């Protein structure tokens, strides 16, 4: 099962109206199973183990940037049908591929193979 996407990103915590990034740097990667279901997984870089693994259907979620605190790379996953929102931040040293990863994330979560 090849990974559709994969980049260094850490999870954050949103409480009330404040978003705080978690130092638990992880990896945001996507993989499609033989079931044609796209798997959105977030692994912790600490142990390199997949902490999270949720199947995301097309038009089920939206991957976009958060233009609230400009300074670094912050993206949020908006579950259109899950009614849930996740916060992530890029840990890659260069953003030369940040846009591509961002595009692939949306294309893999909204446009599965």
């Amino acid at each position: 099962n090849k990974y559709l996407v994969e980049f260094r990103a850490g999870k954050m915590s949103l409480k009330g109206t404040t978003v705080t990034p978690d130092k638990r740097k992880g990896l945001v990667y996507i993989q499609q199973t033989d079931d044609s279901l796209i798997h959105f997984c977030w692994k912790d870089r600490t142990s390199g183990n997949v902490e999270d693994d949720l199947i995301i259907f097309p038009d089920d979620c939206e991957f976009k940037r958060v233009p609230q605190c400009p300074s670094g790379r912050v993206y949020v996953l908006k579950f259109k049908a899950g009614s849930k929102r996740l916060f992530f931040w890029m840990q890659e040293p260069k953003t030369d591929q940040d846009e591509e990863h961002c595009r692939k994330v949306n294309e893999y979560l909204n446009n599965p193979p």
Partner: peptide
Amino acid sequence: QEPEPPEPFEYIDD
């Protein structure tokens, strides 16, 4: 080597 994490901020669903 690697970038440091960003500082906390207020988020509002506009």
